[PDB]
Amino acid sequence: MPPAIVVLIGPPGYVGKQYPITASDIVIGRSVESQVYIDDKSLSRSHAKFAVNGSEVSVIDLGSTNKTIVNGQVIPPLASCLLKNNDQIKTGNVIFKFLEKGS
């Protein structure tokens, strides 16, 4: 399977949902235009996005109100983080787990 993110912590409609990360330009946000749409008021309308190049998947912060945090480190606006298996990504009151192979 391609890589994915899983909702570890979130609202009841969303906890445990998995989203495949197959290509660049996938956006996490509360705007309905987002590919990873979560209805949580603490998530920015456009919060973060992914870049994919072969086996490398990175997350990019888009100037979010409540920040993008990977394993306890803040990713400042327009900066990025190369992900690895089991990393946690906190976006407001939502926390995702990154899986190098999705279930």
Residue numbers in the entry: 32 to 134
Paper text:
B. bacteriovorus is an obligate bacterial predator of other Gram-negative bacteria, exploiting adaptations that allow consumption from inside the prey cell periplasm. The DgcB protein appends the C-terminal GGDEF enzymatic domain with an N-terminal forkhead-associated (FHA) domain, known to be used (in other proteins) for interactions with phosphopeptide ligands. DgcB comprised a ~30aa tail, 100aa FHA, 20aa linker and 160aa GGDEF domain. We provide the molecular basis for initiation of c-di-GMP production, demonstrating that the stimulus is a phosphopeptide tail present on the DgcB GGDEF synthase itself.
By combining a tailless DgcB FHA construct (residues 32–131, V32 replaced with an initiating methionine) and synthetic phosphopeptide (N7SDNLEKpTSIVASDT17) in-trans, we were able to obtain complex crystals diffracting to 1.48 Å resolution. The asymmetric unit of this new form contained two FHA domains that were in an offset dimer identical to both the full-length and FHA-only structures, providing a third independent observation of this interaction. The exposed FHA cleft of chain B displays clear density for a bound phosphopeptide, allowing unequivocal modeling of residues 11–21. The conformation of the bound tail region does not differ substantially from that of the unphosphorylated complex (rmsd 1.0 Å for all atoms), but sits relatively deeper into the FHA cleft, making more extensive contacts. The more deeply situated tail is now able to form mainchain hydrogen bonds with R61, K72 and N97 (via both groups of the amide sidechain). The FHA surface creates two depressions which accommodate the two “inwardly projected” residues of the tail (pT14 and +3 V17); the flanking L11 and T21 sidechains sandwich opposing sides of the central FHA body. The central pT14 of the peptide tail is recognized by a multitude of interactions, the sidechain methyl group projecting into a pocket formed by residues 72–75 and 96–97, which positions the phosphate toward the positively charged R61 and R76. The phosphoryl group is tightly co-ordinated by the FHA cleft of DgcB: OG by R61, O1 by S95 and T96, O2 by both the backbone NH and sidechain of R76, and O3 by R76 (and the backbone NH of pT14 also). Comparison of the peptide-bound and unbound FHA domain structures reveals that peptide binding does not induce any obvious gross conformational change or long-range signaling motions, merely alterations in the rotameric states of R61, K72 and R76. Our structure of the FHA:phosphopeptide complex demonstrates that cleft occupancy does not alter the FHA:FHA contacts, at least for a peptide added in trans.
